[PDB]
Design a protein around this nucleic acid. Structure first.
Lengths: 109, 109
DNA sequence: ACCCTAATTAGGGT
DNA sequence: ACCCTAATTAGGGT
């Protein structure tokens, strides 16, 4: 078991910030400080942009999968037959709401 | 056993055309019809440009390995400590010289 | 003129 | 606003 609270704060915040209009790849690009065309410039102004460079894109993906399993995030069909987005669940919003005023743990396996 | 003469003609021709100035990557980019910056535009006017499109870069690389083992191609250290080029052997050049006027077989395994 | 890897992009469908 | 993959380009070791 390990407390992933600090990393969960970054990722769940990124999902919130980007408005749950994209899949999890965009929050990850955001945290990894990407210059990708997929990510709008307005977001590069946010203080969290590029603050997740310590971890690889692959790591952040693996992490997002666990957070889905644990019920903090969910993926759902949106827009059309091709697309899905990644969203905070109510549980994820509750955790984030608290995390926004003091550090929260999020322990995994 | 299979006769790879038609493919050998393309690859050994490509090595010669690029002047043995590179490793095997540039000959393959040439055969696969690449838009790469690495490949000068003058070569895109050659009749063999893009004629190896029906085999993957991976295949051509594997194929080049066999041709080295069978003594048609050699890798040669050149320029500086980082570099090697892929050249025709005397055998490879004799084979290509004949292949230029009538089809030659090149039987593998 | 090497090779490898990460980052990015275009384009089809999944 | 997705996926996976091919293609391309930059950096740097040795």
């Amino acid at each position: 078991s390990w407390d992933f609270g600090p990393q969960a704060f970054k990722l769940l915040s990124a999902v919130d910030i980007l408005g749950e209009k994209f899949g999890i790849g965009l929050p990850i690009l955001f945290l990894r400080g990407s210059n990708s065309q997929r990510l709008a410039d307005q977001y590069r102004r946010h203080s969290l942009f590029g603050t997740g460079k310590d971890q690889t894109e692959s790591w952040w993906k693996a992490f997002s999968r666990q957070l889905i399993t644990e019920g903090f995030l969910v993926e759902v069909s949106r827009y059309n037959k091709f697309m899905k987005i990644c969203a905070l669940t109510k549980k994820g919003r509750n955790w984030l709401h608290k995390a926004n005023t003091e550090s929260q743990s999020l322990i995994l396996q």
